[PDB]
Structure 1
Amino acid sequence: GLMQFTLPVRLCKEIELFHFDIGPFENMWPGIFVYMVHRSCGTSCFELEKLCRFIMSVKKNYRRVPYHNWKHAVTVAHCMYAILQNNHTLFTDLERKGLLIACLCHDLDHRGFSNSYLQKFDHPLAALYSTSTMEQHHFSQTVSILQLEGHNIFSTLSSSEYEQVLEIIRKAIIATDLALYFGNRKQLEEMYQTGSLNLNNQSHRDRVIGLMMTACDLCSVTKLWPVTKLTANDIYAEFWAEGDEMKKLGIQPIPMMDRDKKDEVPQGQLGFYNAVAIPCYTTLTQILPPTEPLLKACRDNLSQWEKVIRGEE
């Protein structure tokens, strides 16, 4: 109760910034997460014994794939942490509690394959869940771990607070399905621009928490160039493995997933920044102005990909 988590000085300072990288020491990632819960939520939010047991079960249910792994989960939670700390007064006690947990859990038991590959393979999960296939699975795995003995970090909540927090987490995790992001941002664009965006409207909050989830999920484009660039290698290593698997089913994959079309990576990054990342962080900065550093860092990395194309690296 009188037990703080503290971090070495460089981490204690750098963890508050959007562009923080959690480092290559896996054994420090739980401590980093707990540190972030304590400052974002309070040391009273979760029974420490229960939190540590929940963190370790979550970790154990991430797989050793190149990108969609335990480091991705803690990275996406840290970005949520930065957004929540730079927008103190906008969010409920429940929202702060649910959103860091949603982010840690958002890709539970990911196999490194898209919803599309599950559907073309005819994976059982695509019969159980016809849309947002992996995301409904991730929420399912979250509920499972929460129901393990000694793992109910929410046990102290009222029946109905418990229900509101699992419903925040469910919507938050579903929203990481990028197919859903495009319409969600178009609506947020229109509501902000016509002046109708209202944060007391629960369906408006939902959309806004949705956009933050896309922003956190994509935060590798908001890091220092060497982090961003090395993460792109992990991202493509899954996509190309997925393309291999498409070819094994007798299907030409899209070029994004075709390791034979590596040479066109720089132009694909451009499309992605222009079609996905920039619009995401633009609309996010409009709604939540202290998130501007994410937009500024994304634009800097877009300009680094422009340099790659011009053969200036």
Structure 2
Amino acid sequence: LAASSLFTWDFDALDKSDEDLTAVCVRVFQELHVIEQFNIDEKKLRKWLQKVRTQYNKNPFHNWRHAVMVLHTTYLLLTSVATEFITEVELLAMLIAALSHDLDHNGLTNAFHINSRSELALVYNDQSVLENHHSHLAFEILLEKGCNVVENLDEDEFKRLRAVIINCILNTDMATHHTKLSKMEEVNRLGGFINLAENNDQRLFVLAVLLHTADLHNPIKPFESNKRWSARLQKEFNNQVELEAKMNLPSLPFMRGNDEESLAKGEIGFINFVVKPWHQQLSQAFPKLDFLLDTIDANLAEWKAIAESYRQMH
């Protein structure tokens, strides 16, 4: 399949088999030339892709297909916006970070770990509990001898690659969303990003911004994809509500809704207060991405129509 046919904005891993998903991940490494750049052993790349997939759990949303969605979307974002400042090391780092960013997720939020006083919350002092666990596991898999995709990087390259993987995964925590939004507003106020290839700190910030954008792939896909994934996330929220009840823990109110009306109500709130203001800042810094505002508006209108037919049939 041609690259411009596989690498489009309508891709959804939901409709693919495990065999095809492994193939899609390989193609992403092929097209970005990171294999020949760092002499990646394809036996270790295939073993790493296998251990990452099996290290994901079978949740409705936070599963291996979500990780492939994030990688594929990250491929599109970097290809469209970052090809003229991202380094070869950072490009490989973003591939490992996208695929590993939700390793061992169990469908439970950080708040669950903090409220339940879980082992993970104790180890990580309630700070970005899930994301710290994902990143830690990412290197435990990556640094097994038979999976060392980055075995040929020298000392300084691996230090940069590791710092990029850590920072990007940690910044998928929604608790740092508004931190990155405020920095993004300040960047757009003085004209946008300049000399990104000279500024390793701000370029790393851009990468974190892009991985976070790719993580929120539901409102920027066709509405059929948006609906299926959002409903799978809603199932995780309702599942956590049930578990929190059995444990006699407090539950957040928006996780209790379990029908189509409350699903549309919630996604309209998520788009209007998280995704759309985010992509309005992203589009200013990167005008090549403002076509996603049209996808977000299209899905928003489609969600508003559903919530309208429920207002009517009172």
What is the TM-score with the length of structure 1 in the denominator?
Answer: 0.91
Partner of 1:97: 92
Partner of 1:124: 119
Q: Is the 8 A contact 1:62 1:70 kept in 2?
A: yes
Partner of 1:180: 176
Matches within 5 A, 1:53-68: 53-68=47-62
Distance in 2 between the 1:154 and 1:306 partners? Answer: 46
Partner of 1:287: 285
Distance in 2 between the 1:274 and 1:41 partners? Answer: 38
Distance in 1 between the 2:275 and 2:243 partners? Answer: 27
Distance in 2 between the 1:303 and 1:196 partners? Answer: 30
Worse-superposed segment, 36-45 or 48-57: 36-45
Q: SS of the counterpart of 1:267?
A: helix
Partner of 1:231: 229
Verify: 1:189 aligned to 2:181, yes or no: no
Distance in 1 between the 2:145 and 2:190 partners? Answer: 49
Inter-CA distance 293–19: structure 2 relative to 1 (3 Å threshold): farther
Worse-superposed segment, 142-151 or 242-251: 242-251
Partner of 2:80: 86
Q: How many residues align?
A: 304
Distance in 2 between the 1:19 and 1:261 partners? Answer: 26
Q: CA deviation at 1:214?
A: 1.4
Q: Is the 8 A contact 2:184 2:282 kept in 1?
A: no
Worse-superposed segment, 274-283 or 97-106: 274-283
Matched letter for residue 139 of structure 2? V
Matched letter for residue 50 of structure 2? M
Q: CA deviation at 1:252?
A: 4.5
Distance in 1 between the 2:220 and 2:35 partners? Answer: 29
Distance in 1 between the 2:90 and 2:157 partners? Answer: 11
Partner of 1:72: 66
1:255-290 CA-to-partner distances (Å, cap 9, x unmatched) read 221146764332221110011111222222222222
Inter-CA distance 26–35: structure 2 relative to 1 (3 Å threshold): same
Verify: 1:165 aligned to 2:161, yes or no: yes
Q: Is the 8 A contact 2:113 2:121 kept in 1?
A: yes
- Unpaired segments of 5 or more residues in structure 1? 1-6
1:78-103 CA-to-partner distances (Å, cap 9, x unmatched) read 00001122132231111111101100
Verify: 1:107 aligned to 2:111, yes or no: no
Q: Is the 8 A contact 2:230 2:263 kept in 1?
A: no
Q: SS of the counterpart of 2:309?
A: coil
Q: SS of the counterpart of 1:68?
A: coil
1:110-149 CA-to-partner distances (Å, cap 9, x unmatched) read 0110000011111100011121100000011011101212
Q: Is the 8 A contact 1:211 1:280 kept in 2?
A: no
Q: SS of the counterpart of 2:162?
A: helix
Distance in 2 between the 1:271 and 1:69 partners? Answer: 24
Partner of 1:306: 304
What is the TM-score with the length of structure 2 in the denominator?
Answer: 0.91
Q: SS of the counterpart of 1:220?
A: coil
Q: SS of the counterpart of 1:90?
A: coil
Q: SS of the counterpart of 2:160?
A: helix
Distance in 1 between the 2:18 and 2:254 partners? Answer: 30
| % identical equivalent positions | 26
Worse-superposed segment, 42-51 or 259-268: 259-268
Q: Is the 8 A contact 1:14 1:20 kept in 2?
A: no
